[PDB]
């Protein structure tokens, strides 16, 4: 007959169930992930100039790269039924295919992938590097992006600069930039490539190259344009993790206030691989997903000089973001009226980067997802009170101007928001509002109405009184609640953090191994702001997207924290206000939009 899963009945040890039986249990409907199996780093994204279609890529099942297309930046169509567009086992990549990026109009006017071809394993920053384990090779797709055919020749970058003792040398990221062109006297619209890694006994680095010939064959090395001492940190480690022991997945792009701009301010996103001391061999224990703003100067060699940094996503399991310029002329942008954008997809590892021992993987028959596509832009925060909170150095914002008479500053930071078409589609269900209210005493106050399924967007503003500052206040929402389970998301002033408490999230965690229930946290400063003569603590503007087990928490256009919320009971759908009674908090009207949408309309599962 069939395998019988009834989510009103208590879970077994989930490891005892048949393979595939929990395929739908925690599976999102509005996120990019393959038809089944494991997803790794995103990469390979490009806009096809001939069609305007946006292609997304990701590592799949540890055997190369799979891909999908989108004509709206909301929904996707698989290429090759989800099967890889390039796989290991060639002359240059006999052991593995790691991340690569695409020159959309490359050799013969075709999408041209420059990627890390792997010949020797293991590879880790903590151990000696095997010579030639990572090279960079070319492949070209002449069939619309379903198959990237390896050029029948050796790698175009056959290793690091002479005698460099690299920790890593991978994830080539191709990009154009007119500011670099002027500084370096490059031909206009030269392609640059950064390769990510570092050097033993020195620290993490991005290795910079430029196209030497129009055939993409030779790549002139321009030095370690950005490097940091081993396990150093931006500021004192508060706002942007650590530079740690190795850089991965370096992206480079340039922004203004609306989106992507070639002449704009220059940013990079990187993963950093961290560790406690002493180092455990071959173990990266901390996977930080950072963004960094910087100025670019030259003294013989070009240099990127960070002036602020933060997290692109604060989630423990968030890492390895890959993004791409998406021009206004693309199919999605033409329909939505968007200007040029930089769209970034963060990876949410499904199994704690392969440390989640005993998770029911064969039952689920999939592992991991990408997060919602995110638009990156320069965000300005006006009318901020010029005080110590605003003026802190080594943080994730900087003062760009002053008004002495008003007593204020204008702050600059990285804007992070859900890509506009995806956001509209997430909100396309049916909506209802809960009335605003002030809470002063301790407890959870049920919503009058809660969603009946685990697929929703909750939006709300939280306004705090002056005395909340430095207090023991905790305020937010309890979600996915029933008598058996609950998840609490709250702001906490004591350490200026958004917290996701997962201690009670999953009844399955009580009966099964490998179901992480540890707290998640990200730093967020609410500044003192001036609005029509009166000073107040900045409003907390919250968006929670729950897509079955995938939780993404956005705040104030500049913050994201994402995690797994693997609730079991069909019942666990209630929402409540939460406040710990330390001070007062005023909640606006809360909007709940239920159902999301189907990001994979041509799949049945």
Ligand X SMILES: OC[C@H]1O[C@](O)(CO)[C@@H](O)[C@@H]1O
Ligand Y SMILES: OC[C@H]1O[C@@](CO)(OC[C@@]2(O)O[C@H](CO)[C@@H](O)[C@@H]2O)[C@@H](O)[C@@H]1O
The gap between the terminal CA atoms of the chain, to the nearest Å, is: 20
Q: Which residue has the tokens 């009674």?
A: 581
Q: Does 31 bind Na ion (CB under 5 A)?
A: no
What mask, x for binding ligand Y by CB under 6 A, covers residues 146 to 165? Answer: --------------------
Q: Does 245 bind ligand X (CB under 6 A)?
A: yes
CA gyration radius, the chain: 24
Residue 256 to residue 439: CA distance in whole angstroms: 39
Q: Does 563 bind Na ion (CB under 5 A)?
A: no
Q: Does 374 bind Na ion (CB under 5 A)?
A: no
Which residue, among 464, 446, 447, has the nearest Cα to 582 in the 3D structure?
Answer: 464
Identify the bridge partners of residue 564 per DSSP, sorted by sequence position. 550
The distance of closest approach from Cβ of residue 116 to ligand Y in the complex, given in angstroms and rounded to an integer, is 6
Q: Of 249, 543, 563, 593, which lies in the binding site for ligand X, with binding defined by CB under 6 A?
A: 543
Nearer to ligand Y, 198 or 360 (CB): 198
- Partner from ligand Y, a copy of itself, Na ion, none binding residue 300, C-beta < 5-8 Å depending on class: none
Q: Does 503 bind a copy of itself (CB under 8 A)?
A: no
Q: Does 408 bind a copy of itself (CB under 8 A)?
A: no
Q: Does 195 bind ligand Y (CB under 6 A)?
A: no
Residues 6+ apart with CB under 8 A from 241: 233, 234, 272, 274, 286, 288, 290, 311
Q: Of 6, 152, 201, 483, which lies in the binding site for ligand X, with binding defined by CB under 6 A?
A: 201
Which residue, among 11, 9, 5, has the nearest Cα to 508 in the 3D structure?
Answer: 11
Q: Of 289, 320, 331, 560, which lies in the binding site for ligand Y, with binding defined by CB under 6 A?
A: 320
User: In this chain, which stretch among 11-19, 157-165, 413-421, 455-463 interacts with a copy of itself, using CB under 8 A?
Assistant: 157-165
Q: Does 112 bind a copy of itself (CB under 8 A)?
A: no
Preceding omega of 122 cis (within 30 degrees of 0): yes
Q: Of 45, 287, 374, 566, which lies in the binding site for Na ion, with binding defined by CB under 5 A?
A: 287
Which residue, among 492, 530, 485, 473, has the nearest Cα to 509 in the 3D structure?
Answer: 485
- The torsion angles phi and psi of 42, rounded to 5 degrees, stand at -70, 160
The distance of closest approach from Cβ of residue 550 to ligand X in the complex, given in angstroms and rounded to an integer, is 15
- Please, are residues 360 and 22 in contact by the beta-carbon 8 Å criterion? yes
Q: Does 230 bind ligand X (CB under 6 A)?
A: yes
The distance of closest approach from Cβ of residue 313 to Na ion in the complex, given in angstroms and rounded to an integer, is 7
The distance of closest approach from Cβ of residue 128 to ligand X in the complex, given in angstroms and rounded to an integer, is 8
Q: Does 60 bind ligand Y (CB under 6 A)?
A: no
User: In this chain, which stretch among 196-204, 257-265, 441-449, 520-528 interacts with ligand X, using CB under 6 A?
Assistant: 196-204
Which residue, among 33, 25, 56, has the nearest Cα to 600 in the 3D structure?
Answer: 33
Nearer to ligand Y, 289 or 479 (CB): 289
Residue 159 to residue 360: CA distance in whole angstroms: 39
Q: Does 284 bind ligand Y (CB under 6 A)?
A: yes
Alpha helices, DSSP H, located in 337-373: 361-364
Q: Does 153 bind a copy of itself (CB under 8 A)?
A: yes
What length does the chain have? 605
Q: Which residue has the tokens 């005993």?
A: 358
Nearer to ligand Y, 241 or 264 (CB): 241
Q: Does 551 bind ligand X (CB under 6 A)?
A: no
SS in 3 state form for 434-469? ECCEEECCEEEEECCCCCCCCEEEEEEEEECCHHHC
Q: Does 198 bind ligand X (CB under 6 A)?
A: yes
How many binding residues for ligand Y (CB under 6 A)?
A: 18
SS in 3 state form for 148-214? CEECCCCCCECCCCCCCCEEEEEEEEEEECHHHHHHHCCCCCCEEEEEEEEECCCEEEEEEEEECCC
Nearer to Na ion, 21 or 562 (CB): 562
Q: Does 156 bind a copy of itself (CB under 8 A)?
A: yes
Q: Of 193, 196, 318, 504, which lies in the binding site for Na ion, with binding defined by CB under 5 A?
A: 318
Q: Does 397 bind ligand Y (CB under 6 A)?
A: no
Q: Does 557 bind ligand X (CB under 6 A)?
A: yes
Q: In sequence order, what DSSP letters do the residues of 522-553 get, joined into one string?
A: EE-PPPEEEETTEEEE--EEEEEEEETTEEEE
Residue 540 to residue 520: CA distance in whole angstroms: 18
Give me the sheet containing 96-103, strands edge to edge: 96-103, 112-118, 134-140, 149-150
Distances (CA, A) of 127 to 168, 249, 279: 10, 20, 10
Q: Of 217, 334, 452, 531, which lies in the binding site for a copy of itself, with binding defined by CB under 8 A?
A: 217
Q: Does 554 bind ligand X (CB under 6 A)?
A: yes
Residue 54 to residue 44: CA distance in whole angstroms: 11
Identify the bridge partners of residue 177 per DSSP, sorted by sequence position. none
Nearer to a copy of itself, 110 or 118 (CB): 118
What mask, x for binding a copy of itself by CB under 8 A, covers residues 74 to 103? Answer: -----------------xx-x---------
The SS3 assignment for 253 reads strand
- Partner from Na ion, ligand X, a copy of itself, none binding residue 318, C-beta < 5-8 Å depending on class: Na ion
Nearer to ligand Y, 67 or 487 (CB): 67
Residue 457 to residue 435: CA distance in whole angstroms: 16
How many binding residues for a copy of itself (CB under 8 A)?
A: 24
Q: Does 167 bind ligand X (CB under 6 A)?
A: yes
Question: Rule CB under 6 A: which residues touch ligand X?
Answer: 125-126, 167, 198, 200-201, 203, 230, 245, 279, 417-418, 423, 459, 543, 554-557
Question: Rule CB under 6 A: which residues touch ligand Y?
Answer: 40-41, 59, 98-99, 116, 121, 123-124, 170-171, 248-249, 271, 273, 284, 319-320
Question: Rule CB under 8 A: which residues touch a copy of itself?
Answer: 91-92, 94, 119-120, 130-133, 135, 152-156, 158-159, 162-163, 212-213, 217-218, 220
């Amino acid at each position: 007959m069939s395998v019988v899963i009834d989510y009103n009945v208590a879970p077994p040890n989930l490891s005892t169930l048949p393979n595939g039986s929990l395929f739908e249990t925690w599976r999102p409907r509005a996120h990019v992930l393959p038809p089944n199996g494991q997803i790794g780093d995103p990469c390979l994204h490009y806009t096809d100039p001939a069609t305007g279609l946006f292609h997304v890529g990701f590592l799949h099942d540890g055997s190369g790269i799979s891909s999908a297309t989108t004509d709206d930046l909301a929904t996707y169509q698989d290429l090759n039924q989800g099967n890889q567009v390039i796989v290991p086992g060639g002359i240059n990549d006999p052991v593995a295919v790691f991340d690569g990026s695409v020159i959309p109009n490359g050799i013969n006017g075709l999408p041209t992938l420059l990627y890390t071809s792997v010949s020797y394993l293991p590879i880790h920053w903590s151990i000696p590097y095997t010579r030639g384990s990572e090279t960079q090779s070319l492949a070209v797709s002449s069939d619309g992006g379903s198959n990237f055919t390896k050029l029948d020749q050796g790698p175009v970058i056959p290793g690091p600069p002479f005698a460099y003792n690299v920790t890593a040398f991978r994830d080539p990221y191709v990009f154009q930039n007119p500011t670099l062109d002027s500084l370096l006297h490059s031909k206009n619209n030269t392609w640059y490539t950064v390769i990510s890694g570092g050097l033993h006994e020195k620290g993490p680095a991005q290795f910079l190259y430029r196209q030497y010939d129009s055939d993409f064959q030779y790549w002139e090395y321009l030095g370690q344009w950005w490097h940091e001492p081993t396990n150093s940190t931006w500021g004192n480690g508060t706002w942007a993790g650590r530079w740690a022991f190795n850089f991965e997945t370096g992206n480079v792009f340039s922004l203004d206030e609306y989106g992507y701009n070639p002449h704009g301010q220059i940013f990079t996103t990187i993963g950093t691989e961290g560790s406690d001391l002493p180092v455990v061999p071959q173990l990266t224990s901390i996977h930080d997903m950072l963004w960094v703003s910087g100025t670019v100067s030259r003294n013989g060699s070009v240099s990127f000089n960070p002036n602020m940094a933060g997290f692109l996503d604060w989630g423990f399991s968030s890492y390895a973001a890959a993004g791409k310029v998406l021009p206004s002329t693309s199919l999605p942008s033409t329909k939505s009226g968007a200007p040029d954008r930089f769209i970034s997809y963060v990876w949410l590892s499904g199994d704690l980067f392969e440390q989640a021992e005993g998770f029911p993987t064969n039952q689920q028959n999939w592992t991991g997802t990408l997060l919602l596509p995110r638009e990156l832009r320069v965000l300005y925060i006006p009318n901020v009170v010029d005080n110590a909170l605003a003026r802190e150095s080594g943080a994730s914002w900087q003062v760009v101007s002053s008004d002495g008479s008003a007593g204020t500053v204008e702050l600059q930071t990285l804007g992070i928001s859900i890509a506009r078409e995806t956001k509209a589609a997430l909100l396309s269900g049916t909506s209802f509002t809960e009335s605003g209210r002030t809470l002063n005493s301790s407890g959870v106050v049920p919503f009058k109405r809660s969603p009946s399924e685990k697929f929703f967007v909750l939006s709300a503003q939280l306004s705090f009184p002056a005395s909340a500052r430095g207090s023991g206040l905790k305020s937010g929402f309890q979600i996915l609640s029933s008598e058996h389970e609950s998840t609490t998301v709250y702001y906490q002033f004591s350490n200026e953090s958004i917290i996701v408490d997962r201690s009670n999230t999953s009844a399955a965690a009580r009966t099964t191994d490998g179901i992480d229930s540890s707290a998640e946290a990200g730093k967020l400063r609410l500044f003192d702001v001036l609005n029509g003569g009166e000073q107040a603590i900045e409003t907390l503007d919250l968006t929670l997207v729950v897509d079955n087990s995938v939780l993404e928490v956005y705040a104030n256009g500049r913050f994201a924290l994402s995690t797994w919320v693997r609730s079991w009971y069909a019942n666990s759908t209630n929402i409540s206000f939460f406040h710990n009674g330390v001070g007062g908090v005023a909640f606006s009207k809360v909007t709940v939009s239920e159902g999301l949408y189907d990001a994979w309309p041509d799949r049945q599962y």
